[PDB]
């Protein structure tokens, strides 16, 4: 059934859907019963020239009336996700001339399913453009520009869902970016409600909730913020082909603002928000003025809003903040170094998260010991204050080892399982079809404490129990942290007091070991 | 000053056996106000914060405080007062210093019953807003820890409540459970740690999973409490609520309509962060949904829901959750057949990554349906997928075993296209071992002998300058191919192959200049000698020649015991030496070739060898 034989499966249903209330299985379920998954190397065109007039006559009717609860919305969404499932290598313009007339009709209206074709049909025309160029690049890209011109009307009428993820990037872009600059600047550098400046009078600091009950709808902020996070994700790509101008100091305050008012009821947007943040911070010149304007103080646990999804966004956010802090390493004075080792030793001693983040935090403190040594070598007056810092971080190393040792026998229990789950998983491998060790002898001889374990018995487990080697993780932690300790304890030799008070006969032995 | 006061009091309690106060506890409260005052002094004036000596003093102070608290008659109030003491600051728990005292608090079976009293004023600490959310989260830790400790290493709620005798906190939990209305004022009152609602969800899950039969007047409050969590907007709280309501409707109190609703809500729109939650939820929900859907005969729409959602998000990543939904239970299946084409197309699209271990468990499903019986195009589809997967490169051996069982329930020569060419040769050899063994199963491999002869001509002449594994793994399929009941009643079709392979052994044994040509002759001569008593008996002297070459480069490996590198290529020469022993020894029809062969055998007994084949040659002398 990978041929024209599908057509007689709906040759009786070749006519249109009459009485569309109870006819939900006649014509719309042709890509739904059986004829959606069979192989088609060059078998599409035996029926693909029958899909386009059939779906065309389907799309001629079914107007823009969205408010009624599906007398026609079912077949509308049915042809919508038919349009995404079809992959073609021919006749691209019969697809393209019959999809634009609906997306040019839903420019200002977005309420009660008002035009949710667009985030799928513009992506399908993007996919057909990426198959082969159709030299239509100045017609379809104007509609999203009129969306951007409609957004002042959308913000004045609310006293959304643009989804611009692949809408402006086409991987070549031989066009201008100034209109893209203006359509970004018309909504980025504005107060997104008229109420966010007046909540900063209570800033003495941060807002956990988005708005304290000022907008009645409370769903527009959720959608508008989601769209703002989408656009803040998507203008990062523009930086690599050409340098962005007309504004350079407007991104950090909007980054801190969007991190402050992400909703606690969702967690997907924070992922690409932190991804856009690390894509900014992976550059060379954008990461210089950013630590000045956040002052390295709004980069704390305010970025986890709602403490039931700030457990998957922990390693990402901590790794980006630590990567940027390791990237600067010269702007930091001693106060910011104290403030960051005070939080990263807590990340190291936190047992709730993974081992790789703790190893990364220990690596960050080892990367900071050079800046501490150089700053202490600059001015000797704060040279004791640096040295005590080197006794903080290694103290946390001493704590981390302690946090392992108390788990010792508990670790041994899992090691027991790691014997059996290995011992029953290597003796199922000797059932191979190989020979020369059995047929040879056949041919020859034929003629002759539960304290940490209480977490693993919770009824809502939320994560499967690990089956990795605990002794390998323990050896990894011990070897890494002991190499770091050897480095820092050798580096403590520059903060010795002068040996004139002890008045030793050999100061050449001093300032090497004795301190 | 704080360090001085702490170690002065620690010295005064160390010099005595117990407290110098004699468990009075008035200077310890003075030390508590000392700690609060020095924390306020270090928070207002910003001079020098977060030292070493401050942390060591706080550790010593917690040690002496919890030393006094385990040495008193009223242990119930000062522990919660210590939780008040670090409300503003000072860590979240003294790791294995406070939690060790709480693990002492969880005595087995509550014989003394102090812990039940502790749970009483513990939940009074929870419901009263006398502290911030972090210490009520530590109250979650202690309450749920003693509850699941009584659940795990005892009977599930068999000692606390026996005939509704002394509940004494469950009515406070009724008062707590009743406030959930209007979203437990989540919107109205701002709480920024969401561990509190997860605490309450896990506490209800403890009561549901532990013992839902001794309690019967609480169940409507339980189901409305766990159902009010459905209408939230977060994901992990929503799927944990789905998990606990599937726990309840798998236990008892089964409704008719909404169980299909929570089922279709479980298997629709589930992203990456909640995969284990929906796995546990479906694995708990579906064995009672099957037995309570089949209470009436004709309702079997719960397969149609899976089919509709499987064809909804077609050829995407989220379908894989449904792909191993049908794999973890299987006895509720082998009642549909479009599932088979669906999973065959899914494994054929997912084979081309790291999810290969998914697709094998798809194929291991299909055979489990076939043995459940004890189409047509899909047979050659899945066998072509299996052959292409095993020649594309544990679990490949599982693919081997499943194809070997599946053939007996493509059948043309496709391997002409089969660096990595030697790896494809070995995988092709492993494939043709059984795919020639499993067809024409009456010893009927003679019709395709020219085709398979031209197929294997490019690998029976393999080991001229390349590795040994090609011949060592094609040896098995040659050993299967050259047993065709001999040629005494059939036409001379295996006989030209026999003459061809014996002249190949001849022309490869005329090459004695390197250690690569000597393996092919002895291996193919051994398979001819094993599968036939007749062999090259007029041409047995090149076997003696290669045996003497094997002896004279055993002289080269006599003065070293082992090789530094390339160790396998000496013990494989010893292995083919054990081959050539029996091969040139079991026939004693030699001519003038007996005396140099026996002198080489005596030379082999002479110098230092390994015992495992010296015992073989003394058994051979016994014969």
PDB file of C-alpha atoms in Angstrom, chain B residues 131-247:
ATOM      1  CA  UNK B 131       9.197  30.347  61.058  1.00  0.00           C
ATOM      2  CA  UNK B 132      10.164  30.682  57.414  1.00  0.00           C
ATOM      3  CA  UNK B 133       9.753  27.992  54.764  1.00  0.00           C
ATOM      4  CA  UNK B 134      13.251  26.527  55.137  1.00  0.00           C
ATOM      5  CA  UNK B 135      12.781  25.205  58.648  1.00  0.00           C
ATOM      6  CA  UNK B 136       9.348  23.876  57.754  1.00  0.00           C
ATOM      7  CA  UNK B 137      11.181  22.080  54.918  1.00  0.00           C
ATOM      8  CA  UNK B 138      13.504  20.574  57.541  1.00  0.00           C
ATOM      9  CA  UNK B 139      10.265  19.631  59.309  1.00  0.00           C
ATOM     10  CA  UNK B 140       9.287  17.835  56.079  1.00  0.00           C
ATOM     11  CA  UNK B 141      12.627  16.030  56.333  1.00  0.00           C
ATOM     12  CA  UNK B 142      12.052  14.777  59.890  1.00  0.00           C
ATOM     13  CA  UNK B 143       8.311  13.962  59.537  1.00  0.00           C
ATOM     14  CA  UNK B 144       8.471  12.194  56.176  1.00  0.00           C
ATOM     15  CA  UNK B 145      11.730  10.513  57.204  1.00  0.00           C
ATOM     16  CA  UNK B 146      10.240   8.859  60.281  1.00  0.00           C
ATOM     17  CA  UNK B 147       7.078   8.007  58.322  1.00  0.00           C
ATOM     18  CA  UNK B 148       8.885   6.235  55.482  1.00  0.00           C
ATOM     19  CA  UNK B 149      11.314   4.691  57.959  1.00  0.00           C
ATOM     20  CA  UNK B 150       8.336   3.116  59.706  1.00  0.00           C
ATOM     21  CA  UNK B 151       6.998   2.170  56.272  1.00  0.00           C
ATOM     22  CA  UNK B 152      10.235   0.608  55.033  1.00  0.00           C
ATOM     23  CA  UNK B 153      11.877  -1.304  57.893  1.00  0.00           C
ATOM     24  CA  UNK B 154       8.579  -2.316  59.562  1.00  0.00           C
ATOM     25  CA  UNK B 155       5.006  -2.947  58.538  1.00  0.00           C
ATOM     26  CA  UNK B 156       3.315  -0.140  56.636  1.00  0.00           C
ATOM     27  CA  UNK B 157       1.648   1.891  59.434  1.00  0.00           C
ATOM     28  CA  UNK B 158       1.070  -1.088  61.724  1.00  0.00           C
ATOM     29  CA  UNK B 159       2.519   0.299  64.973  1.00  0.00           C
ATOM     30  CA  UNK B 160       1.221   3.884  65.075  1.00  0.00           C
ATOM     31  CA  UNK B 161      -2.457   3.145  64.371  1.00  0.00           C
ATOM     32  CA  UNK B 162      -3.950  -0.251  65.250  1.00  0.00           C
ATOM     33  CA  UNK B 163      -7.677   0.319  65.932  1.00  0.00           C
ATOM     34  CA  UNK B 164      -7.670   4.138  65.581  1.00  0.00           C
ATOM     35  CA  UNK B 165      -5.830   4.239  68.899  1.00  0.00           C
ATOM     36  CA  UNK B 166      -3.834   7.479  69.481  1.00  0.00           C
ATOM     37  CA  UNK B 167      -3.690   9.104  65.995  1.00  0.00           C
ATOM     38  CA  UNK B 168      -3.120  12.490  67.704  1.00  0.00           C
ATOM     39  CA  UNK B 169      -1.831  14.279  64.602  1.00  0.00           C
ATOM     40  CA  UNK B 170      -4.096  12.957  61.835  1.00  0.00           C
ATOM     41  CA  UNK B 171      -6.895  15.316  62.867  1.00  0.00           C
ATOM     42  CA  UNK B 172      -4.388  18.156  62.556  1.00  0.00           C
ATOM     43  CA  UNK B 173      -3.649  16.722  59.131  1.00  0.00           C
ATOM     44  CA  UNK B 174      -7.406  16.845  58.469  1.00  0.00           C
ATOM     45  CA  UNK B 175      -7.356  20.541  59.380  1.00  0.00           C
ATOM     46  CA  UNK B 176      -4.324  20.922  57.098  1.00  0.00           C
ATOM     47  CA  UNK B 177      -5.881  18.962  54.216  1.00  0.00           C
ATOM     48  CA  UNK B 178      -9.138  20.983  54.413  1.00  0.00           C
ATOM     49  CA  UNK B 179      -7.393  24.371  53.746  1.00  0.00           C
ATOM     50  CA  UNK B 180      -6.376  23.310  50.157  1.00  0.00           C
ATOM     51  CA  UNK B 181      -9.496  25.028  48.776  1.00  0.00           C
ATOM     52  CA  UNK B 182      -8.896  28.079  46.581  1.00  0.00           C
ATOM     53  CA  UNK B 183      -5.424  26.700  45.665  1.00  0.00           C
ATOM     54  CA  UNK B 184      -4.302  26.630  49.393  1.00  0.00           C
ATOM     55  CA  UNK B 185      -3.937  30.409  49.053  1.00  0.00           C
ATOM     56  CA  UNK B 186      -0.895  29.982  46.808  1.00  0.00           C
ATOM     57  CA  UNK B 187      -1.866  33.056  44.811  1.00  0.00           C
ATOM     58  CA  UNK B 188      -3.171  35.004  47.849  1.00  0.00           C
ATOM     59  CA  UNK B 189      -0.152  34.350  50.125  1.00  0.00           C
ATOM     60  CA  UNK B 190       3.359  34.485  48.685  1.00  0.00           C
ATOM     61  CA  UNK B 191       5.543  31.469  49.446  1.00  0.00           C
ATOM     62  CA  UNK B 192       8.716  31.256  47.389  1.00  0.00           C
ATOM     63  CA  UNK B 193       9.854  27.711  48.186  1.00  0.00           C
ATOM     64  CA  UNK B 194       7.735  25.137  46.336  1.00  0.00           C
ATOM     65  CA  UNK B 195       9.099  22.351  48.542  1.00  0.00           C
ATOM     66  CA  UNK B 196       6.083  22.841  50.821  1.00  0.00           C
ATOM     67  CA  UNK B 197       3.476  21.656  48.328  1.00  0.00           C
ATOM     68  CA  UNK B 198       5.753  18.800  47.275  1.00  0.00           C
ATOM     69  CA  UNK B 199       6.063  17.935  50.982  1.00  0.00           C
ATOM     70  CA  UNK B 200       2.284  17.727  51.231  1.00  0.00           C
ATOM     71  CA  UNK B 201       2.031  15.680  48.024  1.00  0.00           C
ATOM     72  CA  UNK B 202       4.654  13.216  49.240  1.00  0.00           C
ATOM     73  CA  UNK B 203       2.934  13.006  52.647  1.00  0.00           C
ATOM     74  CA  UNK B 204      -0.325  12.063  50.957  1.00  0.00           C
ATOM     75  CA  UNK B 205       1.583   9.574  48.814  1.00  0.00           C
ATOM     76  CA  UNK B 206       2.962   8.029  52.024  1.00  0.00           C
ATOM     77  CA  UNK B 207      -0.564   7.577  53.343  1.00  0.00           C
ATOM     78  CA  UNK B 208      -1.886   6.211  50.031  1.00  0.00           C
ATOM     79  CA  UNK B 209       0.971   3.784  49.333  1.00  0.00           C
ATOM     80  CA  UNK B 210       1.352   2.671  52.954  1.00  0.00           C
ATOM     81  CA  UNK B 211      -2.052   1.522  54.176  1.00  0.00           C
ATOM     82  CA  UNK B 212      -5.311   2.723  52.563  1.00  0.00           C
ATOM     83  CA  UNK B 213      -7.526   0.029  54.151  1.00  0.00           C
ATOM     84  CA  UNK B 214      -7.402   0.785  57.892  1.00  0.00           C
ATOM     85  CA  UNK B 215      -8.548   4.369  57.193  1.00  0.00           C
ATOM     86  CA  UNK B 216     -11.854   5.061  55.450  1.00  0.00           C
ATOM     87  CA  UNK B 217     -13.293   8.436  56.550  1.00  0.00           C
ATOM     88  CA  UNK B 218     -10.351  10.458  55.203  1.00  0.00           C
ATOM     89  CA  UNK B 219     -10.469   9.348  51.577  1.00  0.00           C
ATOM     90  CA  UNK B 220     -12.678  12.067  50.079  1.00  0.00           C
ATOM     91  CA  UNK B 221     -10.421  14.727  51.604  1.00  0.00           C
ATOM     92  CA  UNK B 222      -7.399  12.817  50.261  1.00  0.00           C
ATOM     93  CA  UNK B 223      -8.718  12.620  46.705  1.00  0.00           C
ATOM     94  CA  UNK B 224      -9.868  16.245  46.644  1.00  0.00           C
ATOM     95  CA  UNK B 225      -6.473  17.309  48.010  1.00  0.00           C
ATOM     96  CA  UNK B 226      -4.551  15.316  45.423  1.00  0.00           C
ATOM     97  CA  UNK B 227      -6.973  16.445  42.702  1.00  0.00           C
ATOM     98  CA  UNK B 228      -6.587  20.154  43.484  1.00  0.00           C
ATOM     99  CA  UNK B 229      -2.919  19.793  42.478  1.00  0.00           C
ATOM    100  CA  UNK B 230      -3.958  18.797  38.932  1.00  0.00           C
ATOM    101  CA  UNK B 231      -5.152  22.291  38.004  1.00  0.00           C
ATOM    102  CA  UNK B 232      -1.736  23.933  38.472  1.00  0.00           C
ATOM    103  CA  UNK B 233       0.536  25.077  35.658  1.00  0.00           C
ATOM    104  CA  UNK B 234       3.919  23.608  36.621  1.00  0.00           C
ATOM    105  CA  UNK B 235       5.031  20.239  35.245  1.00  0.00           C
ATOM    106  CA  UNK B 236       6.722  18.190  37.983  1.00  0.00           C
ATOM    107  CA  UNK B 237       4.062  18.987  40.585  1.00  0.00           C
ATOM    108  CA  UNK B 238       1.420  18.115  37.976  1.00  0.00           C
ATOM    109  CA  UNK B 239       2.953  14.752  37.140  1.00  0.00           C
ATOM    110  CA  UNK B 240       3.590  13.954  40.809  1.00  0.00           C
ATOM    111  CA  UNK B 241      -0.097  14.643  41.407  1.00  0.00           C
ATOM    112  CA  UNK B 242      -0.921  12.367  38.472  1.00  0.00           C
ATOM    113  CA  UNK B 243       1.309   9.718  40.053  1.00  0.00           C
ATOM    114  CA  UNK B 244      -0.383   9.926  43.434  1.00  0.00           C
ATOM    115  CA  UNK B 245      -3.917   9.885  42.003  1.00  0.00           C
ATOM    116  CA  UNK B 246      -2.964   6.858  39.909  1.00  0.00           C
ATOM    117  CA  UNK B 247      -1.678   5.317  43.148  1.00  0.00           C
TER     118      UNK B 247
END
